[PDB]
Amino acid sequence: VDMVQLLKKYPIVWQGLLALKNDTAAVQLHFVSGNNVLAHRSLPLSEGGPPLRIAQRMRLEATQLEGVARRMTVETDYCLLLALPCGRDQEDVVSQTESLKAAFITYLQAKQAAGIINVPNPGSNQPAYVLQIFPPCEFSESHLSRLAPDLLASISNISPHLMIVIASV
């Protein structure tokens, strides 16, 4: 995983944890596509970044993916992010990967859904923001390879990851 290539086009926008049920996974979010400001305004912080909780889910249907693609082709309305397990060290990375695979990856793929995280915009306090956590499904990698081949070449090895779509409305 070489960030030195990909960060030149799309650098990290957030670093913290994801949390659903009671299972957390420390992940760092690389920018992929869309409006980077969307991530800065959606992804909350205080110490570094409180765990993004999964409060909803989008069943990824072929029909849904069409609708998603429609708002994905308009970079401004959505933000595309790549969440990778951020470990302190190699061992820590393994543990985060392990937790992430079992808690988020397996769950999201089992549901065939999008982990929907509602965040409020700082000062606005309106949770009208949807971060869609899509599993490492073909759909995800296909768009990722088209949108960010630079970072894609790094995630091909760390396939156990999430594709997070920040959607306005």
Partner: peptide
């Protein structure tokens, strides 16, 4: 978008 399962 349903309602998943977090901590509230």
């Amino acid at each position: 978008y349903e309602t998943l399962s977090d901590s509230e």
